[PDB]
Design a protein around this ligand. Structure first.
Ligand SMILES: CN(C)C(=O)Cc1ccc(-c2nc(N)nc3ccccc23)cc1
Length: 154
């Protein structure tokens, strides 16, 4: 019982792009860009579409870097999140009524204002490592348990 979601990180040699979500699920947190995958759409095509819709950026090369399964205790549907990375983008990030993008230096990642699991796998993403993770949450702020491992193939 799961649903597909995408998560895209624009990671350049000295900075990473994150977006502050204004409303709905995850509002008030910085995260990468993404969302649900459409019927008849590949996961990578959904990731590209969502990056454009939310950041205003155009991407050509997306690299699969991780898969994270999120469970919220008491919620039947697991979130199967496919994580992607890109260093090659076109355009400038756009602020909209749904999203406020901002560039962060790699030593200034705003972990206190991100989902709490990010503190675990973001250091792997920064060291160009690929991973599989599972995080069990009680509400939106508490990690009850988790698994996280580096993989060669996502
Ligand atoms: C704006 N985005 C990226 C989405 O709407 C899809 C989505 C939403 C939330 C999460 C997510 N990210 C992280 N880092 N931690 C989470 C913890 C629990 C649930 C979702 C989480 C991933 C993709």
């Amino acid at each position: 019982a799961s649903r597909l979601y995408t998560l895209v990180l624009v990671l350049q040699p000295q900075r990473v792009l994150l977006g502050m979500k204004k409303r709905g699920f995850g509002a008030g947190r910085w995260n990468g860009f993404g969302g649900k995958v459409q019927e008849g759409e590949t996961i990578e095509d959904g990731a590209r579409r969502e990056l454009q819709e939310e950041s205003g950026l155009t991407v050509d090369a997306l690299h699969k870097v991780g898969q994270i399964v999120f469970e919220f205790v008491g919620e039947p549907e697991l979130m199967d999140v496919h994580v992607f990375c890109t260093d090659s983008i076109q355009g400038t990030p756009v602020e909209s009524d749904e999203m406020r993008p901002c560039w962060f230096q790699l030593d200034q990642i705003p972990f206190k204002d991100m989902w709490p699991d990010d503190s675990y796998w973001f250091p792997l993403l920064l060291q160009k490592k690929k991973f599989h993770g599972y995080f069990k949450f009680q509400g939106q702020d508490t990690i009850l348990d988790y698994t996280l491992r580096e993989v060669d193939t996502v």
